[PDB]
Amino acid sequence: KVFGRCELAAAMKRHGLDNYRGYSLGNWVCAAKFESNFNTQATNRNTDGSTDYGILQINSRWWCNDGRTPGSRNLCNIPCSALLSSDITASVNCAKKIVSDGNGMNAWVAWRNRCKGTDVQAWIRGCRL
């Protein structure tokens, strides 16, 4: 599924990401935009052979099991394919674990490079939330 911006904002808000660990909703929407272009089916292969999955491009090196990232962890205890669902619950719940792990949203490269320190509230501007 390719979410609309506000649709995703609303979904993320309903799933408790607004101000989760102090990260306002726009951070999450911004991260999703630049990680996946709001596409839950996005996958990208990393140089180390892991793959990033889903709307928040959660990687299989650490967070999910895709059966083809040897020596990786599965800290979200999910098949990576669960992160591709049109239902973002699995991504959100895993993202909550990630962002809780001490490094905040810096785990999301795109967030660090494209959202962090920007006016992320713009990403939820106009949305009914």
Ligand X SMILES: CC(=O)N[C@@H]1[C@@H](O)[C@H](O[C@@H]2O[C@H](CO)[C@@H](O)[C@H](O)[C@H]2NC(C)=O)[C@@H](CO)O[C@@H]1O
52 in catalytic set: yes
**Could you tell me which residues are annotated as the binding site for substrate?**
101
59 binds ligand X (CB under 6 A): yes
What percent helix, strand, coil does the chain show, rounded to 5?
40, 10, 50
Map residues 94-123 to x or -, x wherever contact with Cl ion holds by CB under 5 A. ----------x----------------x--
Q: Which is nearer to ligand X, 28 or 62 (CB)?
A: 62
Burial 67-76 (b: 16+ CB within 10 A, else e): eebeebebbb
Nearest to 52 by CA among 80, 88, 78: 80
* Contact status: 88 vs Cl ion (CB under 5 A): yes
Active-site residue (options: 7, 18, 48, 52): 52
Choice between 57 and 69, CB closer to Cl ion: 69
Catalytic (active site) residue 7: no
Contacted by 11, from Cl ion, Na ion, ligand X, none: CB < 5 to 8 Å by type: Cl ion
Binding-site partner at residue 106 among Cl ion, ligand X, Na ion, none, CB < 5 to 8 Å by type: none
Read off the tokens for 10.
Answer: 């609303």
d(CA 35, CA 111): 8
Torsion of CA 31, 91, 87, 127, to 10 degrees: -30
Catalogue the active-site residues.
35, 52
